[PDB]
Amino acid sequence: KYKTKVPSPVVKCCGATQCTSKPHPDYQCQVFSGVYPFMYGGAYCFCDTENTQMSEAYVERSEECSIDHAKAYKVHTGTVQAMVNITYGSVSWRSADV
Amino acid sequence: KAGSFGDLQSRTSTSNDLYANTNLKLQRPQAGIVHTPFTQVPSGFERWKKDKGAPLNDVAPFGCSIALEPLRAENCAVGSIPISIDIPDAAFTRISET
Amino acid sequence: KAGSFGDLQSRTSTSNDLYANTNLKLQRPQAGIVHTPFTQVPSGFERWK
Amino acid sequence: DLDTHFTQYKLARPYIADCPNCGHSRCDSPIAIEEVRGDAHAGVIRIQTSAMFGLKTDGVDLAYMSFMNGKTQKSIKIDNLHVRTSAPCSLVSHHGYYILAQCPPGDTVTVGFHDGPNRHTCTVAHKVEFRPVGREKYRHPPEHGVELPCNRYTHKRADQGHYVEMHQPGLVADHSLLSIHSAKVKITVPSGAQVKYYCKCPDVRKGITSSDHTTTCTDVKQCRAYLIDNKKWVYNSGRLPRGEGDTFKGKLHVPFVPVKAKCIATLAPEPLVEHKHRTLILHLHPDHPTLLTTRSLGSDANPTRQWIERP
Amino acid sequence: PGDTVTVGFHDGPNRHTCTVAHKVEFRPVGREKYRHPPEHGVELPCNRYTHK
Amino acid sequence: DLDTHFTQYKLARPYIADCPNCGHSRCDSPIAIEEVRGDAHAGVIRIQTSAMFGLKTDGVDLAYMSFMNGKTQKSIKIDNLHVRTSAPCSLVSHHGYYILAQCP
Ligand SMILES: *[C@@H]1O[C@H](CO)[C@@H](O)[C@H](O)[C@H]1NC(C)=O
């Protein structure tokens, strides 16, 4: 199962920014213009529309991937082994892997 | 493919080169809110775990028992086994002595 | 028979001679715990209802 | 030792982030939920929040928690810290930013705490499912049964190879730093911090001040003020504005990492078996949806797979 | 959602409650049957009881 | 009279026994659940526990309960004694080892 990593967005007030490509799995980046975000302390930006938020996201392996994962294998002819238990005459049972 | 078994693939569980195929798409943030919304196809590994079906452990013919360490099929009752055993010469008693 | 209407039978509601047929099996206690686990077929009277 | 697990968390602070439901409406919450991990089997979920648990101003103390109250960080004893999905959840342990809980299925995850007369909660939409182990769909861990391997989030706070990044906080907008004063906007700077300001009145002004500054504008609405305080770092949260440059400052370990464990699964009642010529008759009386599978031991397995939900 | 509606309050050591049978349903607006208001999505017109 | 209903319960004590989900992890609980009776129609159930309700060391008092604290029996006034299944249950009455409640 995958995890999506989402870094802190870049909020540019009274200006604009641009997205760049990055070497991340399923990396996404987009700049949304005309934002007027608010924080606990009030309006974050001064300009009413000349502000942009650049969002980023990419896919990661989740923490569970270390224990909960499926392994895909190519299977070829290998070997055949057996455990054989043998007794004869007055000799008691003896066994070995063959 | 996204939402299917192989949407996320890694050559090994500790590699640093990950393949991911999900429709991860960044969505516009809600008005006045600083966050990074997105949509994505639900994990195909979780989907597969729901739709796995019967494992080989439950459908193998000839009564095979499937074990993993190492991967093997045990006690498959197929065919016959030629054998050759060299019995110690001390295990034999002469006819006139019996 | 267990799980069917007549799994539990008594001649009268106050009778001291009771017949019971359920697959009541004692299970091994969990490690370190003093208790009496068991498995049993759900009542056939409640099933009949 | 216990303090050895908080060496890096002591370098991070709690923060206020957007919460989709602060009671009845969206707000900026000091207990905002960042992530809910619910991939363990027996209903265990791990919740990441913006609040810090186990630390006080004087050091490590598992009975204390810390959260932001505006620009000021507050430290209190844990009081009625709770988690709810569809019904009250039992708390297992807590660690900086993280809560480990034992929850029933639900459509939401609610986390909150009390601070004297104050109540702080955050509810997010998240499908929490109970995942039974094995061939029986039980709805609560049984008292007894068959012990099977399962995936669980451990209760240990130890560093187990999983980390998250803590970054230099971005600009924190705070309009309370501004006052009209003598009909001329003044900027108040908290001790040890710097305040960036941006004013666009007839005299357009901007800059960073380390002490109380009076600008040329006469209306607070004409100015913006941002608090710069990098003495404590924060998680690389997707709900916080990013700083400028390379803001990465360190790593924080994830406490309650997923581990392999043994879970007790239910054990169905023994079937009644009747025999007829070349026929096996099974009378199945399940307690929970129980999976029945069969196969022939010949060259054609002819497998059968069905879930038995009723007798 | 629920099958009952319970209302109550405390008066010192006393607790006064009243429960009535009433089916409460969640009504997602739109063409998707979500079970709790989303954090993000498409904003659609809906019916609400005002807080005023 | 009410005292006549506790003449035999005055001779018994509470006990500590295994509870599969005592708190958040299996432990020996002083209020372990021995039986849940849920065959009544209108959602009313009867629960048998290891704790004693309605009895104190000084006599009968329905506002008090007794439980074992290790080897020592302690009698306390009932404080938020509660039952829940999927949501809070209304308590009807309590007596000795038994709790009567209406549950969803
Ligand atoms: C071999 O056979 C004897 C008798 O049948 C038995 O006691 C012994 O355990 C067997 N050995 C193995 C490895 O199964």
XYZ file of C-alpha atoms and ligand atoms in Angstrom:
726
model
C 0.000 0.000 0.000
C 1.269 3.448 -0.932
C 1.563 6.628 1.114
C 1.189 10.092 -0.414
C 3.705 12.648 0.850
C 2.498 16.254 0.784
C 5.105 18.909 1.686
C 4.094 22.295 3.026
C 2.588 24.354 0.171
C 4.380 27.472 -1.033
C 2.068 30.452 -0.483
C 3.339 33.489 -2.392
C 1.649 36.735 -1.377
C 1.389 39.581 -3.888
C 3.265 37.555 -6.469
C 3.536 34.212 -8.205
C 5.727 31.112 -8.339
C 6.314 28.305 -10.845
C 6.355 24.506 -10.649
C 9.362 22.374 -11.569
C 9.694 18.656 -12.170
C 11.305 16.473 -9.517
C 12.575 12.865 -9.359
C 9.770 11.608 -7.122
C 7.303 8.764 -7.784
C 4.068 10.025 -9.353
C 5.159 13.573 -8.527
C 2.491 16.263 -8.941
C 2.892 20.044 -8.764
C 0.439 22.824 -9.582
C 0.227 26.556 -8.871
C -3.219 27.879 -7.916
C -3.588 31.627 -8.436
C -6.168 33.933 -6.903
C -5.970 32.512 -3.374
C -6.600 34.555 -0.218
C -5.750 32.165 2.627
C -6.386 32.793 6.317
C -4.396 31.491 9.286
C -5.100 31.618 13.013
C -3.714 35.170 12.971
C -5.891 36.482 10.140
C -5.443 36.964 6.420
C -2.087 35.553 5.357
C -1.660 37.678 2.212
C -2.232 41.382 1.619
C -3.303 41.336 -2.026
C -6.863 40.238 -2.740
C -6.116 38.145 -5.846
C -2.408 38.515 -6.714
C -1.449 35.488 -4.602
C -0.587 31.906 -5.514
C -0.319 28.593 -3.678
C 1.972 25.937 -5.156
C 0.878 22.446 -4.095
C 3.139 19.392 -4.254
C 2.513 15.691 -3.753
C 4.256 12.405 -4.487
C 3.864 8.721 -3.638
C 5.907 6.780 -1.078
C 5.909 3.298 0.372
C 3.888 3.262 3.570
C 5.341 2.240 6.922
C 3.376 -1.023 6.736
C 5.281 -1.945 3.558
C 8.068 -3.408 5.715
C 5.714 -6.118 7.056
C 2.591 -6.059 4.837
C 3.627 -6.514 1.202
C 3.251 -8.998 -1.655
C 6.301 -10.492 -3.379
C 6.114 -11.176 -7.126
C 8.354 -14.078 -8.173
C 9.428 -15.764 -11.381
C 9.370 -19.517 -10.715
C 11.685 -21.982 -12.450
C 12.353 -25.681 -11.997
C 14.439 -26.173 -8.879
C 15.137 -29.286 -6.822
C 13.158 -32.047 -5.129
C 14.010 -33.173 -1.603
C 12.469 -35.689 0.760
C 12.772 -37.022 4.293
C 13.099 -40.812 4.181
C 12.540 -43.095 7.178
C 14.194 -46.500 6.702
C 14.419 -49.699 8.739
C 15.757 -53.072 7.642
C 16.401 -56.415 9.280
C 16.940 -55.831 12.988
C 18.067 -52.210 12.500
C 15.798 -49.605 14.080
C 14.318 -46.717 12.101
C 16.803 -44.158 10.749
C 16.011 -41.121 8.610
C 17.724 -38.371 6.642
C 16.995 -35.663 4.088
C 17.703 -36.819 0.528
C -2.158 0.134 -13.594
C -3.753 2.517 -11.114
C -6.080 0.846 -8.641
C -4.801 -2.606 -9.637
C -2.265 -4.966 -8.091
C 0.813 -3.316 -9.595
C -0.036 0.363 -9.097
C 2.946 0.510 -6.702
C 6.057 -1.530 -7.517
C 9.499 -1.726 -5.922
C 12.376 -4.003 -6.881
C 13.075 -4.598 -3.182
C 11.513 -3.392 0.055
C 14.524 -1.143 0.809
C 15.189 0.314 -2.648
C 15.309 4.043 -3.386
C 13.752 3.776 -6.879
C 9.982 3.317 -6.649
C 7.398 2.923 -9.411
C 3.972 4.383 -8.645
C 0.941 4.660 -10.936
C -2.032 6.376 -9.307
C -4.217 9.194 -10.614
C -2.768 11.532 -8.030
C -4.163 14.939 -8.955
C -3.809 18.127 -6.950
C -7.082 19.947 -6.311
C -7.574 23.642 -5.738
C -7.489 24.590 -2.039
C -10.774 25.626 -0.491
C -11.336 29.370 -0.323
C -9.430 30.962 2.547
C -7.887 27.665 3.701
C -4.219 26.655 3.649
C -4.089 22.939 2.845
C -3.158 20.652 -0.052
C -6.226 18.752 -1.286
C -5.869 16.004 -3.859
C -7.642 13.009 -5.354
C -6.098 9.616 -5.983
C -7.139 6.129 -7.035
C -7.638 3.839 -4.007
C -4.694 1.512 -3.459
C -4.774 -1.563 -5.675
C -2.946 -3.585 -3.042
C -5.844 -3.114 -0.629
C -8.203 -3.892 -3.514
C -6.272 -7.061 -4.337
C -6.328 -8.187 -0.698
C -10.124 -8.002 -0.929
C -10.326 -9.790 -4.302
C -7.417 -12.240 -3.897
C -9.666 -15.273 -4.214
C -8.529 -18.767 -3.307
C -4.763 -19.174 -2.760
C -2.700 -21.976 -4.237
C -2.612 -23.355 -0.683
C -6.326 -24.183 -1.059
C -6.553 -25.356 -4.695
C -3.321 -27.244 -5.378
C -4.078 -30.709 -6.846
C -2.758 -34.005 -5.482
C -2.999 -32.780 -1.882
C 0.023 -30.481 -2.079
C 0.867 -28.428 1.020
C 2.436 -25.042 0.220
C 5.229 -23.702 2.454
C 7.269 -20.510 2.053
C 10.697 -20.887 3.743
C 11.834 -21.850 1.158
C 8.857 -21.673 -1.218
C 7.932 -25.289 -1.873
C 5.064 -27.707 -2.476
C 5.050 -30.583 0.012
C 3.553 -34.078 -0.201
C 2.283 -33.917 -3.795
C 1.164 -37.496 -4.587
C 2.206 -37.552 -8.254
C 3.815 -40.496 -10.056
C 6.312 -42.950 -8.589
C 9.854 -42.904 -7.209
C 12.647 -45.239 -8.381
C 14.826 -46.307 -5.457
C 18.155 -48.057 -4.917
C 19.469 -48.918 -1.438
C 22.792 -50.630 -0.670
C 22.269 -52.838 2.401
C 25.337 -53.545 4.584
C 26.850 -56.984 4.055
C 26.737 -57.547 7.832
C 22.918 -57.445 7.785
C 22.691 -60.746 5.865
C 22.716 -64.203 7.449
C 23.449 -67.377 5.508
C 20.637 -69.771 4.599
C 22.166 -72.664 6.544
C 22.302 -70.429 9.638
C 18.561 -69.608 9.636
C -29.005 -32.982 17.536
C -26.819 -29.949 18.180
C -27.970 -26.691 16.621
C -31.438 -28.047 15.795
C -34.771 -27.487 17.516
C -34.453 -30.380 19.961
C -30.808 -30.015 21.008
C -31.984 -29.330 24.583
C -34.869 -31.457 25.851
C -36.699 -31.810 29.157
C -39.853 -33.769 29.929
C -41.188 -30.835 31.973
C -40.068 -27.288 32.697
C -39.323 -28.287 36.316
C -37.874 -31.733 35.567
C -34.551 -32.640 37.168
C -33.610 -34.933 34.241
C -32.381 -32.808 31.328
C -31.119 -33.982 27.937
C -28.591 -31.792 26.131
C -26.723 -32.381 22.865
C -24.366 -29.583 21.834
C -20.810 -29.792 20.510
C -19.490 -28.445 23.792
C -15.706 -28.777 23.571
C -13.255 -27.478 26.151
C -10.436 -25.416 24.649
C -6.945 -25.013 26.028
C -6.635 -21.917 28.245
C -4.725 -18.988 26.828
C -1.112 -18.875 27.980
C -0.805 -17.530 31.519
C -4.558 -17.007 31.996
C -6.871 -18.789 34.440
C -10.162 -19.289 32.605
C -12.255 -22.039 31.005
C -12.664 -21.405 27.266
C -14.916 -23.605 25.165
C -16.706 -23.856 21.835
C -20.338 -24.840 21.448
C -22.967 -24.967 18.722
C -25.363 -21.992 18.942
C -28.673 -22.945 20.526
C -31.076 -24.640 18.137
C -34.024 -23.120 19.978
C -32.822 -19.608 19.156
C -32.020 -20.869 15.652
C -35.540 -22.280 15.330
C -37.034 -18.939 16.415
C 15.566 5.247 29.852
C 12.506 7.189 28.683
C 14.127 10.549 27.880
C 16.238 8.939 25.135
C 13.102 8.722 22.964
C 12.416 12.496 23.074
C 15.850 13.874 22.110
C 14.600 15.109 18.722
C 11.005 15.839 19.742
C 12.346 18.358 22.260
C 13.561 20.298 19.202
C 10.048 20.512 17.691
C 6.990 22.465 18.827
C 3.239 21.996 18.395
C 1.429 24.100 15.828
C -2.034 25.280 14.825
C -3.336 23.952 11.517
C -6.653 23.885 9.706
C -9.160 21.328 10.974
C -12.234 20.489 8.852
C -14.444 20.194 11.968
C -13.759 22.070 15.208
C -16.966 20.967 16.817
C -19.576 22.178 14.332
C -17.370 24.210 11.960
C -13.954 24.396 10.335
C -11.251 26.230 12.278
C -7.514 26.404 12.910
C -7.054 23.761 15.603
C -4.147 23.124 18.011
C -5.080 19.404 17.851
C -5.496 19.252 14.066
C -5.282 15.710 12.692
C -2.558 15.269 10.067
C -2.800 11.534 9.366
C -4.729 8.477 10.515
C -3.064 5.086 10.077
C -5.624 2.295 10.276
C -4.071 -0.666 8.466
C -3.590 -2.818 11.579
C -5.826 -5.836 12.132
C -7.502 -5.697 15.541
C -8.858 -2.158 15.243
C -5.650 -0.367 16.266
C -5.149 3.046 14.659
C -2.335 5.587 14.939
C -3.227 9.285 14.728
C -0.799 12.112 13.986
C -1.832 15.530 15.292
C -0.327 19.002 15.567
C -0.113 18.732 19.376
C 2.830 17.423 21.395
C 2.302 14.712 24.013
C 4.695 13.585 26.723
C 6.678 16.833 26.988
C 6.472 19.745 29.410
C 8.526 22.920 29.657
C 10.837 21.207 32.176
C 11.401 17.981 30.228
C 9.749 14.638 29.496
C 6.570 13.783 31.399
C 4.016 11.363 29.954
C 1.273 12.963 32.076
C 1.748 16.326 30.308
C 1.033 17.646 26.829
C 1.871 20.853 24.985
C -0.087 22.802 22.388
C -0.030 26.250 20.825
C -2.362 28.967 22.119
C -1.779 31.638 19.511
C 1.888 32.565 19.195
C 2.556 31.214 22.714
C 3.117 27.520 23.423
C 1.147 26.221 26.421
C 1.920 23.159 28.562
C -0.786 21.427 30.611
C -1.456 18.101 32.253
C -3.365 15.729 29.992
C -7.048 16.192 30.849
C -9.714 14.011 29.209
C -7.651 13.446 26.084
C -9.932 11.252 23.985
C -10.336 9.618 20.584
C -13.661 8.647 19.011
C -14.646 7.089 15.676
C -18.174 5.727 16.200
C -17.790 5.200 19.960
C -15.158 6.011 22.595
C -11.742 4.530 21.844
C -9.242 3.226 24.374
C -5.902 5.021 24.307
C -2.798 2.842 24.294
C 0.014 5.407 24.450
C 1.034 8.809 23.133
C 4.223 10.391 21.835
C 5.122 13.711 20.267
C 2.519 14.399 17.559
C 1.291 10.781 17.807
C -1.579 8.970 19.530
C -2.077 5.191 19.522
C -5.690 4.091 20.030
C -7.883 0.970 19.983
C -11.028 1.961 18.061
C -14.244 0.400 16.734
C -15.226 0.850 13.076
C -16.480 4.256 12.030
C -16.767 6.870 9.312
C -14.884 9.596 11.217
C -11.982 10.013 13.627
C -12.361 12.524 16.461
C -9.521 13.643 18.732
C -9.702 16.251 21.465
C -8.542 17.378 24.877
C -9.652 19.653 27.706
C -7.888 22.732 29.104
C -9.747 23.883 32.192
C -13.072 25.240 30.927
C -11.851 25.006 27.307
C -12.556 22.101 24.943
C -10.486 21.420 21.808
C -11.589 18.753 19.319
C -10.911 17.928 15.670
C -13.019 15.537 13.567
C -11.983 14.272 10.127
C -13.707 11.939 7.683
C -11.860 8.611 7.625
C -13.208 5.086 7.201
C -11.995 3.014 10.151
C -12.502 -0.718 9.656
C -12.043 -3.649 11.998
C -9.840 -6.201 10.264
C -10.187 -9.742 11.650
C -7.352 -12.219 11.221
C -8.056 -15.512 9.489
C -11.110 -17.243 8.052
C -13.724 -15.742 10.408
C -15.155 -12.217 10.247
C -15.362 -11.485 13.953
C -16.256 -7.958 15.051
C -14.222 -7.711 18.280
C -11.084 -9.536 19.477
C -12.248 -12.743 21.171
C -11.380 -13.823 24.683
C -10.050 -17.123 23.340
C -9.438 -18.891 20.057
C -6.600 -19.614 17.629
C -3.548 -17.353 17.773
C -2.574 -16.123 14.294
C 0.118 -13.733 13.027
C -1.170 -10.223 12.433
C -0.116 -6.662 11.661
C -0.248 -4.280 14.617
C 1.081 -0.857 15.519
C 3.451 -1.431 18.417
C 2.969 0.336 21.741
C 6.709 1.040 22.005
C 8.060 4.585 21.679
C 11.461 3.378 20.433
C 13.011 4.516 17.162
C 12.415 1.611 14.771
C 13.703 2.914 11.426
C 10.796 5.130 10.298
C 11.208 8.905 10.300
C 9.424 12.131 9.416
C 11.052 15.468 8.638
C 10.906 18.544 10.867
C 11.428 21.867 9.094
C 12.040 25.486 9.961
C 8.556 27.019 10.371
C 7.272 29.258 7.616
C 5.973 32.760 8.117
C 3.221 32.896 10.742
C 0.665 35.584 9.944
C -0.360 37.400 13.129
C -2.369 40.626 12.968
C -2.275 41.010 16.769
C 1.295 42.324 16.403
C -0.140 45.558 14.938
C -1.598 48.492 16.881
C -2.711 51.932 15.692
C -1.050 53.508 18.772
C -0.766 57.318 18.225
C -2.765 57.245 14.992
C 0.280 55.574 13.443
C 0.577 51.794 13.147
C 3.165 50.276 15.497
C 4.682 46.783 15.253
C 5.277 44.950 18.538
C 8.043 42.324 18.391
C 8.090 39.502 20.990
C 11.410 39.040 22.770
C 13.863 36.876 20.839
C 11.753 36.895 17.657
C 11.754 38.907 14.445
C 8.666 40.271 12.691
C 8.385 40.668 8.928
C 5.913 43.349 7.869
C 4.335 44.501 4.608
C 2.434 47.799 4.394
C 0.915 49.254 1.221
C -0.531 52.604 2.283
C 0.508 55.754 0.336
C 3.990 55.035 1.730
C 4.600 51.412 0.727
C 6.928 49.762 3.243
C 8.260 46.275 3.939
C 11.056 44.620 5.867
C 12.069 42.583 8.901
C 12.417 44.211 12.328
C 13.917 42.747 15.503
C 12.405 45.385 17.819
C 9.273 47.491 18.167
C 8.818 49.493 14.968
C 6.471 52.332 14.010
C 5.554 52.545 10.324
C 4.188 55.368 8.163
C 0.675 53.887 7.824
C -2.281 54.877 9.998
C -4.534 51.820 9.564
C -3.850 48.239 10.637
C -5.770 46.959 7.609
C -3.069 48.547 5.430
C -0.352 46.308 6.923
C 0.511 42.642 7.337
C 2.789 41.214 10.018
C 4.492 37.824 10.207
C 6.212 36.311 13.239
C 9.647 34.776 12.617
C 10.581 32.315 15.370
C 12.899 29.457 14.387
C 13.901 28.334 17.889
C 11.571 25.313 17.550
C 10.902 23.310 14.388
C 7.648 21.855 13.066
C 6.557 18.871 11.019
C 6.611 19.302 7.237
C 2.822 19.652 7.326
C 0.779 20.070 4.158
C -1.463 22.544 6.024
C 1.331 24.989 6.945
C 3.000 27.554 4.664
C 6.522 26.630 3.626
C 9.523 28.751 4.503
C 12.083 30.137 2.089
C 15.201 28.260 1.056
C 16.071 24.827 2.401
C 13.976 24.552 5.566
C 14.920 20.962 6.478
C 16.422 20.895 9.978
C 16.195 17.307 11.239
C 14.350 14.010 11.502
C 11.738 12.759 13.962
C 11.240 9.034 14.427
C 7.756 7.536 14.147
C 7.054 5.880 17.532
C 4.295 3.300 16.996
C 5.580 1.659 13.816
C 3.745 -1.357 12.341
C 5.113 -4.706 13.508
C 4.245 -8.364 13.134
C 2.377 -9.738 16.136
C 0.191 -12.641 17.221
C -3.557 -11.984 17.408
C -6.272 -14.220 18.845
C -8.843 -15.114 16.191
C -12.183 -16.783 16.775
C -12.580 -20.546 16.378
C -15.850 -21.735 14.837
C -17.983 -24.456 16.467
C -17.173 -28.049 15.595
C -19.339 -29.215 12.651
C -21.659 -32.197 12.817
C -20.452 -34.724 10.236
C -22.701 -37.373 8.678
C -21.481 -40.041 6.258
C -23.212 -41.516 3.216
C -21.842 -43.539 0.317
C -19.100 -41.376 -1.218
C -20.672 -38.301 0.409
C -19.585 -36.025 3.261
C -22.439 -34.135 4.942
C -21.444 -31.159 7.103
C -23.872 -29.250 9.331
C -22.303 -25.827 9.877
C -23.509 -23.530 12.687
C -21.295 -20.426 12.570
C -21.102 -17.629 15.116
C -19.604 -15.195 12.585
C -19.241 -15.336 8.800
C -16.946 -18.363 8.506
C -15.064 -19.409 5.375
C -15.425 -23.025 4.222
C -13.045 -24.409 1.594
C -12.675 -27.898 0.151
C -10.605 -29.638 -2.500
C -10.208 -33.125 -3.898
C -6.864 -34.824 -3.335
C -6.720 -36.192 -6.885
C -5.476 -34.782 -10.164
C -8.488 -32.409 -10.288
C -8.740 -30.385 -7.078
C -12.296 -29.211 -7.927
C -11.970 -26.534 -5.204
C -14.943 -25.019 -3.382
C -14.853 -21.675 -1.548
C -17.833 -20.135 0.247
C -18.481 -17.970 3.305
C -21.000 -19.466 5.741
C -22.957 -16.710 7.482
C -25.908 -18.719 8.853
C -26.541 -22.392 9.710
C -27.010 8.794 11.704
C -28.951 6.942 14.372
C -32.236 5.376 15.406
C -32.814 7.560 18.492
C -32.345 11.173 19.560
C -31.216 11.774 23.146
C -31.125 15.190 24.820
C -30.179 15.930 28.408
C -28.434 18.182 30.889
C -27.022 18.181 34.417
C -28.273 20.066 37.481
C -25.644 19.549 40.153
C -25.837 15.862 41.078
C -29.024 15.433 39.003
C -29.155 14.303 35.367
C -32.241 14.976 33.225
C -32.432 13.250 29.836
C -35.081 12.422 27.240
C -34.711 9.863 24.430
C -37.185 9.506 21.550
C -37.233 7.074 18.643
C -36.391 9.071 15.509
C -34.395 7.982 12.476
C -31.628 10.489 11.767
C -30.057 10.096 8.335
C -27.001 11.645 6.726
C -27.928 13.201 3.378
C -24.914 13.791 1.126
C -25.553 16.446 -1.505
C -24.584 15.557 -5.054
C -23.996 12.344 -6.995
C -21.748 10.635 -4.402
C -22.949 9.003 -1.169
C -20.336 10.186 1.304
C -20.806 9.486 5.016
C -19.303 12.658 6.523
C -18.653 16.196 5.208
C -15.435 16.151 3.165
C -12.416 18.297 3.862
C -12.356 19.266 0.182
C -14.317 18.692 -3.000
C -16.963 20.434 -5.087
C -19.190 22.986 -3.361
C -22.881 22.368 -4.116
C -26.067 24.145 -2.984
C -27.715 22.415 -0.046
C -30.390 22.695 2.637
C -29.190 23.669 6.110
C -30.679 24.896 9.361
C -29.156 28.315 9.899
C -27.154 29.029 13.041
C -28.697 32.496 13.343
C -37.821 -4.105 53.580
C -34.624 -3.787 51.539
C -32.126 -5.414 53.923
C -33.798 -8.811 53.436
C -32.623 -8.924 49.800
C -28.919 -8.811 50.793
C -28.832 -11.391 53.614
C -26.912 -13.855 51.423
C -24.880 -11.241 49.539
C -23.492 -9.976 52.854
C -21.720 -13.351 53.099
C -19.977 -12.961 49.712
C -17.151 -10.682 48.597
C -16.058 -9.250 45.249
C -13.097 -10.760 43.448
C -10.473 -9.998 40.810
C -10.561 -12.102 37.653
C -9.238 -12.118 34.108
C -10.862 -9.654 31.700
C -9.920 -10.037 28.006
C -9.899 -6.266 27.345
C -9.295 -4.821 30.805
C -8.552 -1.207 29.952
C -6.793 -1.387 26.581
C -4.997 -4.699 27.224
C -5.870 -7.969 28.934
C -5.471 -7.723 32.711
C -7.065 -8.955 35.937
C -9.987 -6.609 36.549
C -11.874 -6.031 39.821
C -15.092 -5.642 37.772
C -14.539 -8.481 35.313
C -17.635 -9.547 33.380
C -18.778 -13.119 34.040
C -22.012 -13.207 32.029
C -24.148 -11.042 29.754
C -27.829 -11.964 29.464
C -29.372 -10.405 26.369
C -32.428 -12.508 25.532
C -35.017 -9.886 26.522
C -36.978 -8.000 23.874
C -36.672 -4.269 24.499
C -32.872 -4.119 24.506
C -32.572 -4.796 28.246
C -29.578 -6.870 29.344
C -28.310 -8.202 32.667
C -24.564 -8.278 33.359
C -22.857 -10.292 36.090
C -19.567 -8.830 37.287
C -16.997 -9.625 39.944
C -17.868 -6.432 41.860
C -20.482 -6.077 44.601
C -23.089 -3.333 44.185
C -25.310 -1.947 46.923
C -23.225 -3.233 49.847
C -20.705 -1.496 52.084
C -18.830 -2.875 55.075
C -21.272 -1.015 57.352
C -24.457 -2.461 55.840
C -26.720 -2.105 52.826
C -26.522 1.140 50.854
C -27.606 1.231 47.212
C -25.363 4.267 46.622
C -22.241 2.224 47.478
C -20.272 -0.546 45.796
C -17.457 -2.820 46.953
C -14.547 -4.200 44.949
C -11.244 -5.921 45.645
C -8.046 -3.864 45.618
C -5.511 -6.662 45.702
C -6.105 -8.581 48.918
C -8.139 -5.743 50.491
C -11.841 -5.136 49.884
C -12.662 -1.432 49.505
C -16.137 0.114 49.661
C -16.679 3.355 47.741
C -19.652 5.462 46.770
C -20.634 4.744 43.176
C -18.864 7.148 40.817
C -19.888 7.058 37.143
C -20.684 3.356 37.081
C -21.511 2.858 33.410
C -22.300 0.298 30.724
C -21.989 0.673 26.965
C -22.190 -1.607 23.933
C -22.136 0.722 20.911
C -23.335 3.762 22.877
C -24.076 4.619 26.518
C -26.625 2.357 28.196
C -29.198 3.447 30.753
C -28.799 1.660 34.073
C -31.970 0.256 35.612
C -30.734 -1.130 38.939
C -27.825 -3.023 40.475
C -27.663 -5.775 43.078
C -24.741 -7.834 44.308
C -22.789 -9.100 41.312
C -25.453 -7.999 38.791
C -26.089 -4.865 36.720
C -29.338 -4.250 34.832
C -29.121 -1.903 31.842
C -30.955 -0.987 28.627
C -28.488 -1.050 25.729
C -28.565 -0.415 21.976
C 10.486 -43.077 11.696
O 9.553 -44.110 12.051
C 9.444 -44.387 13.458
C 8.405 -45.475 13.602
O 7.435 -45.406 12.565
C 9.085 -43.114 14.227
O 9.106 -43.386 15.623
C 10.069 -42.003 13.897
O 9.677 -40.798 14.544
C 10.104 -41.781 12.394
N 11.024 -40.706 12.059
C 10.635 -39.559 11.493
C 11.717 -38.557 11.224
O 9.461 -39.336 11.213
